[PDB]
Design an enzyme around this catalytic site. Sequence first.
Site, PDB file in Angstrom:
ATOM      1  N   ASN A  74       0.840  -1.181   0.000  1.00  0.00           N
ATOM      2  CA  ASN A  74       0.000   0.000   0.000  1.00  0.00           C
ATOM      3  C   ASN A  74       0.887   1.247   0.000  1.00  0.00           C
ATOM      4  O   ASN A  74       1.595   1.526   0.986  1.00  0.00           O
ATOM      5  CB  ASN A  74      -0.914  -0.027   1.216  1.00  0.00           C
ATOM      6  CG  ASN A  74      -1.768   1.223   1.332  1.00  0.00           C
ATOM      7  OD1 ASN A  74      -1.433   2.155   2.084  1.00  0.00           O
ATOM      8  ND2 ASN A  74      -2.874   1.258   0.593  1.00  0.00           N
ATOM      9  N   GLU A  75       0.864   1.985  -1.114  1.00  0.00           N
ATOM     10  CA  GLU A  75       1.543   3.297  -1.187  1.00  0.00           C
ATOM     11  C   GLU A  75       3.072   3.274  -0.955  1.00  0.00           C
ATOM     12  O   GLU A  75       3.614   4.162  -0.289  1.00  0.00           O
ATOM     13  CB  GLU A  75       0.883   4.311  -0.231  1.00  0.00           C
ATOM     14  CG  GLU A  75      -0.598   4.522  -0.513  1.00  0.00           C
ATOM     15  CD  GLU A  75      -1.236   5.668   0.261  1.00  0.00           C
ATOM     16  OE1 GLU A  75      -0.731   6.043   1.345  1.00  0.00           O
ATOM     17  OE2 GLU A  75      -2.288   6.177  -0.227  1.00  0.00           O
ATOM     18  N   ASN A  77      -5.343   4.567  -4.642  1.00  0.00           N
ATOM     19  CA  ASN A  77      -5.985   5.317  -3.584  1.00  0.00           C
ATOM     20  C   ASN A  77      -6.207   6.727  -4.132  1.00  0.00           C
ATOM     21  O   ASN A  77      -5.231   7.409  -4.482  1.00  0.00           O
ATOM     22  CB  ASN A  77      -5.036   5.367  -2.388  1.00  0.00           C
ATOM     23  CG  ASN A  77      -4.769   3.977  -1.783  1.00  0.00           C
ATOM     24  OD1 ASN A  77      -3.823   3.795  -0.982  1.00  0.00           O
ATOM     25  ND2 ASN A  77      -5.585   2.999  -2.166  1.00  0.00           N
ATOM     26  N   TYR A 120      -8.796  15.751  -0.971  1.00  0.00           N
ATOM     27  CA  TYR A 120      -7.478  16.384  -0.858  1.00  0.00           C
ATOM     28  C   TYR A 120      -7.310  17.278  -2.057  1.00  0.00           C
ATOM     29  O   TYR A 120      -6.527  16.978  -2.946  1.00  0.00           O
ATOM     30  CB  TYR A 120      -6.334  15.367  -0.810  1.00  0.00           C
ATOM     31  CG  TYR A 120      -6.203  14.635   0.504  1.00  0.00           C
ATOM     32  CD1 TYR A 120      -6.237  13.250   0.544  1.00  0.00           C
ATOM     33  CD2 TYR A 120      -6.044  15.326   1.714  1.00  0.00           C
ATOM     34  CE1 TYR A 120      -6.111  12.544   1.747  1.00  0.00           C
ATOM     35  CE2 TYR A 120      -5.925  14.615   2.944  1.00  0.00           C
ATOM     36  CZ  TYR A 120      -5.955  13.219   2.937  1.00  0.00           C
ATOM     37  OH  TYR A 120      -5.839  12.465   4.108  1.00  0.00           O
ATOM     38  N   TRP A 178     -12.748   4.198   1.594  1.00  0.00           N
ATOM     39  CA  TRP A 178     -11.936   4.454   2.790  1.00  0.00           C
ATOM     40  C   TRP A 178     -12.752   5.414   3.670  1.00  0.00           C
ATOM     41  O   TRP A 178     -12.852   6.567   3.347  1.00  0.00           O
ATOM     42  CB  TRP A 178     -10.563   5.048   2.360  1.00  0.00           C
ATOM     43  CG  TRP A 178      -9.566   5.016   3.464  1.00  0.00           C
ATOM     44  CD1 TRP A 178      -9.167   6.068   4.242  1.00  0.00           C
ATOM     45  CD2 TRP A 178      -8.887   3.854   3.972  1.00  0.00           C
ATOM     46  NE1 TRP A 178      -8.260   5.634   5.186  1.00  0.00           N
ATOM     47  CE2 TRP A 178      -8.063   4.285   5.036  1.00  0.00           C
ATOM     48  CE3 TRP A 178      -8.862   2.502   3.595  1.00  0.00           C
ATOM     49  CZ2 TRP A 178      -7.237   3.403   5.757  1.00  0.00           C
ATOM     50  CZ3 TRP A 178      -8.045   1.613   4.314  1.00  0.00           C
ATOM     51  CH2 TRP A 178      -7.249   2.072   5.392  1.00  0.00           C
ATOM     52  N   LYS A 212     -12.776   9.416   8.171  1.00  0.00           N
ATOM     53  CA  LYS A 212     -13.347   9.109   6.858  1.00  0.00           C
ATOM     54  C   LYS A 212     -14.368   7.976   6.891  1.00  0.00           C
ATOM     55  O   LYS A 212     -14.870   7.526   5.841  1.00  0.00           O
ATOM     56  CB  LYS A 212     -12.234   8.830   5.840  1.00  0.00           C
ATOM     57  CG  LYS A 212     -11.416  10.104   5.562  1.00  0.00           C
ATOM     58  CD  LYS A 212     -10.438   9.922   4.428  1.00  0.00           C
ATOM     59  CE  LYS A 212      -9.580  11.175   4.237  1.00  0.00           C
ATOM     60  NZ  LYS A 212      -8.694  11.337   5.453  1.00  0.00           N
TER      61      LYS A 212
END
Lengths: 661, 661, 328
Positions: free
Chosen positions: C60-61, C109, C115, C194, C215
């Site tokens: 993840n990321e 994501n 954002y 999410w 969230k």
Amino acid sequence: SLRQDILLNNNWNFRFSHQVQGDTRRVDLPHTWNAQDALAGKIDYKRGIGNYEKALYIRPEWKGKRLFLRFDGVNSIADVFINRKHIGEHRGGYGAFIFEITDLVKYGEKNSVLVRANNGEQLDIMPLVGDFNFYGGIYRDVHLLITDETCISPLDYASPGVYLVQEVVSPQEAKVCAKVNLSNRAADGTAELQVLVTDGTKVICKESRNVSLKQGADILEQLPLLIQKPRLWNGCEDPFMYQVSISLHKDGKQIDSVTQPLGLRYYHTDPDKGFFLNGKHLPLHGVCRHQDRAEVGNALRPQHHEEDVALMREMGVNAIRLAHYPQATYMYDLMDKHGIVTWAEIPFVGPGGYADKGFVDQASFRENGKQQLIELIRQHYNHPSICFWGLFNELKEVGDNPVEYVKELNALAKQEDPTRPTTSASNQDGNLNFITENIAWNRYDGWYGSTPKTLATFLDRTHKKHPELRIGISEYGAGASIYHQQDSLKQPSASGWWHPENWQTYYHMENWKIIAERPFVWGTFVWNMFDFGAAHRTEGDRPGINDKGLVTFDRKVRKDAFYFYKANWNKQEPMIYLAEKRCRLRYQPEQTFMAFTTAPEAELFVNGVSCGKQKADTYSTVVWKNVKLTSGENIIRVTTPGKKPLTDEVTVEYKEDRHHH
Amino acid sequence: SLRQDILLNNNWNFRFSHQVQGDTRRVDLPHTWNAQDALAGKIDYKRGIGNYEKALYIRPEWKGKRLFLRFDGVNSIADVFINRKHIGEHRGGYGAFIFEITDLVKYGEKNSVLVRANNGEQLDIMPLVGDFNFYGGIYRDVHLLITDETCISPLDYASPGVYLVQEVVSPQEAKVCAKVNLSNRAADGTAELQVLVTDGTKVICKESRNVSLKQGADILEQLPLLIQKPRLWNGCEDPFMYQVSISLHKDGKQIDSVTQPLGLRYYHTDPDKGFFLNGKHLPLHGVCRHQDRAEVGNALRPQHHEEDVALMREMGVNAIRLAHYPQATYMYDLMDKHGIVTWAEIPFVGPGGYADKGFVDQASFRENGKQQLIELIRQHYNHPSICFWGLFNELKEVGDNPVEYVKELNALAKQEDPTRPTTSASNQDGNLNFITENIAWNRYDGWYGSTPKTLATFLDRTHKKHPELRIGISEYGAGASIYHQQDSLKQPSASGWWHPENWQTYYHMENWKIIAERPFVWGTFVWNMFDFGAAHRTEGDRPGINDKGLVTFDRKVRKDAFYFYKANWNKQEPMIYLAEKRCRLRYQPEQTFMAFTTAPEAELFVNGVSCGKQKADTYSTVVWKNVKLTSGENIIRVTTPGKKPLTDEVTVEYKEDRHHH
Amino acid sequence: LMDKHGIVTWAEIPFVGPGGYADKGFVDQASFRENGKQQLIELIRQHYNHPSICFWGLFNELKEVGDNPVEYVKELNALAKQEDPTRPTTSASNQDGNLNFITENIAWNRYDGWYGSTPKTLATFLDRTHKKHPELRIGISEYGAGASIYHQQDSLKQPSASGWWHPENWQTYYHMENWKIIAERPFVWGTFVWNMFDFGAAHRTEGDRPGINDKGLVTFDRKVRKDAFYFYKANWNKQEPMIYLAEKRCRLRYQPEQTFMAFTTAPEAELFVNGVSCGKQKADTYSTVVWKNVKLTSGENIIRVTTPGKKPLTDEVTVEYKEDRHHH
Ligand SMILES: [Cl-]
Ligand SMILES: [Cl-]
Ligand SMILES: [Cl-]
């Protein structure tokens, strides 16, 4: 019936009220509970209630006497209980206070004394803000005082109960009015009050009055004293004091007595010529000093006060600003003894560059401030060292405007004590500067931006525009860590984590030269003699410290600036000191060495070979330029002239490496 | 000239004063800054000053009107500034307060409102101690109130300014004295005061008086009301209230108006027979409730009050003790609306099993306590639900003895409001019990040691020795974590980290049986309806929590005891509930199953096969013994009688393992 | 429970990168690398038999800058395929470039409209990626927006993500717009909100309290379902009849022209204000009914919505309408 003064410092039981269980640990006074948390830089250090309890055996033979608990200082509110019954409260962290317990105790048994001290935030007790720590607890001594039923009263704002008011003072004669508080709990009767002035074994004055004292009487009696051709307290030149014994007598027996100093002097401040003590001009070579120290916080022991004064006299200090609050009686005693002209002040402190206010315009705040001022004046009235009463530090007009209230404090100071001028420390323009008799500013030209030269411009322009003002400098300074060293001189960011010692040295040398040339400046006070605690600070070599000291927080290490002042202010102790010895690593191809000395010249040696003599300048500084070091270790030595010289020496390492350029 | 009430809850700028820099973050009210630290069990949670500032545009058309800032609650000292000028201070964390700002603002521009709230410890503002958190900040609403220059005054202890004093009440007629505060800032003149009582659209009363109002007048006017054959507020049976409109009129125009409820009733407490409402005996099935909740602390929103009342009515609660302090106007409104007899109290709280004191004998503490009592009575005067004024909780005589001072508060309560009896909650023997009209004790027999049976002995012995006392139980309870489960019944250590839910269930069943049999006990109140915050607690399933709730802190989970009370107190909602469902792992060879139901019997099934019916006992409990489970998973189901039954069901696991034996 | 209830499950090892924060998810040393392989083997062997698990997520990321985990992620992929050839691998990315071309399925994501930006840039990203790289099996491994149930305002305006104001209506709007983008794009093999629940993250300083990632469609204690939960329930659980009035926690109304919105499985719904019908409106393709220019009376108003028929489902709220304010 001799007066007794019994120290109650040992073995108290302590807990915080946030600890709900009731278990306690032993503590011993003087004590603060903020000596670890606030000193580690914890900004939200414990501000609230700490409880101290001790059993006190009340002797059967004290029945028929009077009994008082006197507290030298509790920060900042104290509630006192005897056998768990409330007897009183004191609001204010810096003045002494007292409660008579005569009728509140059980004789011939142990009685509980409980003190619930609170240093929690308040908006009705100065100081409301400040760049220092509000250390909580019973941080000065506690005493049980035992007296005759008829006594010289300890109950007037916890003062000694005698005010030796200096009405006229010259080298030909001094007239003094001895004002004496008397308190009677015995039957109606008369007594003889005697005031006896001595110098060693020699009697200088002796005056007596019969006084009538009703049962329950609390009265003020006044006796005139005349001293012909007095020896005057004349600062460090001759800090002379007479001893005064005040006593009460009945049917050929002394029944009570107290002693106080009498240090006679007169002074004035001229707007153009500066300060005059006993008719003679006296430059005031001053520093400021907070009442804290590394590891112990404000829980100072007498050897701490003693060492602080020793270090100041070593440096040739002759004036002190005991900022920002009333300090220990013992500290003012040491100022009297050593001849140090003292500026003593109440804690009316404003925010500086920080948020919030020093003044909140509500009656509770205002009345408490007046009581703190009366405490300061009455409790410390007799110290000849005190020559100014300071009323505030860095208040500002925006929001609640304290101008009118500061005029009230000024008038109250003048009414309580017409014999000292008032002063204040300002960081503002405008009306706040025109209230007290002497005025001073806190200036950081060359530290908080700018160049030291703007101090000169400020002083000259202010003096020209307002020729009636008696201008002083109540603070000037710069930060330094003894662990931040660099070969080259460059101005650091004040608020940053790099405070090279050489910049502080440079700052003081340049600022002092400006001051020395300006005799209209009646006094200047270095901020600060010592590094001190300020939990919110995040600068220099560690958080929680204001590092503007000439000496470190633990009093162990004198920074280079200390010796610059010592060479210039203490000219009768021969010395030489090589500057920049803590800068062990050298990179510059062309080295400069600098020494401070009381000698007219000095000689430099490098690796045992003389580089020749240089003359000291007007500021006791000798400088050698373009000194060539050899790669690696070099021994640098400086010596004064003559066949028995003084020396200073250091080993440095010279390295030709670096970084880009 | 309609009165305006403008909410000012949104978008304030906040910082702590220990943060010296001046940067702020957005907050929105209601707000406490202790919702994280105190709720995590941090015993020295932040107690000090938090600052809230907001720009308020003062409309040009408000010139000529009067403007008030009213605060529903700020814990515990609030200092309010307009354009940074101090306008006033309020000391006390639970009562409303108000400041007129009419002459303090600049019309047609933005004005700063700054509130400096302080929850730091004090020894002059109750509560001084307590088993709950002193959450700091602006934790209730803030309003800007706009009125005519001549108005029904909002300035009498921040009350609505109208007191509907019930002088005589019976089913034949009610006489009420409407006392109305009037305030005039316009020119000298007259006005017409009208009091209008309605029931829906029907007019029941209408009374008028002309009043003369001098400029600057602040006066109290009284109008008699007579209502024939009134409909009475009769608790949950019929919580009826009239609406009262109080208005001021001039030359055919209404100029100001306020409305208040009128809920008429009468009551008394008999030492032998208990409480009577409107001439009829009424058992008071009570619980206590603190004004906090998980995650938000005491910053409660209206849906939180709404949900708390919904849960109490579901359980069949008909009485409440809103401990330990004045609570929200909205909470008392919901008690009025739902018919719940309410005990409302000031925060005069003692230490319980912990250290320190609830009373400090100094004038500042005593005068502040009287102002907190007057606030409670005047601000909440008109709520019919309030039937008792509580003056203290668990004070003790040792040390500063609050007996005489509590007699003063009692006399002040009776003078302010002769229409309600006083009460108190005690944990002591002796004189403190003989001051208020009704008395109650906090009892934990079967929790803090002993057996529930000693509650019966205490009640019977007290009632026999002191037959004139009107005895209640102001607290009784036991701790439980929903995550602590065990097959067998054994008494846990109260102060330990193991609070099995079955012990709480057992505690309440046994204690309730003792109470139910004793009608001389006028009211009993479970401690507590909900788990609540107490930072110093170190027991049950996590620190910082008092887990004596019948419902968890987040209001999500009802513990078994809740349903025991629901079956016994809310008999008109059919229900069945299987106890011990959270105990999923079973070890005992012989299982007992227990259900609470409003039905006369119930049937148990195990793995789909009936174990037969059992009868409900007098306490709505059905029990099956010696039930045989098969090793592994078992489905347990209970059903009420009939062809359309109610059911409850659980899957448990039966294991023959263990540990030594 | 995923097996039992039929929920297709993506299960992953904790090879997590920094996102917008400092430091790294990968440190290139043998001890780190060998431990990661043991964590992967544990995951696969311990959970091998659950039919719900249909993808193994490997990271993840992560990011390439500094220690570059590309080669190591190829090792994990090959190890996953050797341990279990019966499930595809997947990963959740926030980067461009090579990290996206290792696992069999890939997902990103995305927080377009939270954002910064507008939800519309999610559509542009998906379409452009799918066109440029037609062989990729594209998913959305995270999309969401913050909300406190205690932050309410009458008007729709985008808040600062990192600030202390997360009005619930913006989260509702975010999910409605993003879902419409997703629903229209069947090449997107899976999308994952999410997050289902608010959760703990000690360093967070946003929304209604520190230490929380807000969230969630449901609060941290699982007690309160936020409006977005019911938008999804109406659209995803079509066989349980329901109606839900949105914005009930917004009790104070200021706008002269009110809009009311309901989510329902019914084809239309009727609004009542103070007991008087405002008439019926049709549900749109996304199970939403909207009434505009509704006039409230100053003070308390009772708002009720009902589904059609003689036995309807209802939802109701009391709001307060105030004509006050602040400058304008
Ligand atoms: Cl100020
Ligand atoms: Cl007490
Ligand atoms: Cl990474």
